[PDB]
Amino acid sequence: ATAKLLQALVPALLKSDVFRAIYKRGTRKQVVQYVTNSALQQAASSLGLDASTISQLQTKATQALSSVSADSDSTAYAKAFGLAIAQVLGTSGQVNDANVNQIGAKLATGILRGSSAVAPRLGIDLSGINVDSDIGSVTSLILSG
DSSP, X not given: OHHHHHHHHHHHHHHOHHHHHHSOTTOOHHHHHHHHHHHHHHXXXXXXXXXXHHHHHHHHHHHHHHTSXXXXXXXXXXXXXXXXXXXXXXXXXXXXXXXXXXXXXXXXXXXXXXXXXXXXXXXXXXXXXXXXXXXXXXXXXXXXX
C-alpha cells in the first residue's frame, strides 16, 4: 500500500497550514526531532499500533529527518514523514487498499494535532492558525479530492 499511503498522507501534510508553520526552513534539528517524536507517538497510538511498530516508526523518522538540509523548506519535512511512515506501514499488514485512505487521514489528523499541541512551548507561535479547520480541510482532501 506504499503508493496510495504516500498519495493520501503526503499531500495532506503539504496542504496543511499547521505543518508549514511548525516544520519551517532552518528550524533547530532538536526542535524538529522533538515535535516529530511527539506527533508520531500521538498519531500511531491513535491507530492502536504495538510499541515495537511505533519504535520502528520513530527510528525511521529520525533517519529520514537526518537527510533534511538546514536550507530545506517545509515540503522536505512532509516528504520525510511520508518516507518513514510508508517504509514501516506499507507492506506489514497494518494498511491495505480497503483502509489506506482512512489510515492516511487518521495519521494526518494525529500529526497535525500532536505537532500543534507541543509547538507553542517549543517557541513556535501558532497565533491565528485554526487547527480544527486545517485538519478538516486535509481529511476532506484525502476523502474527496
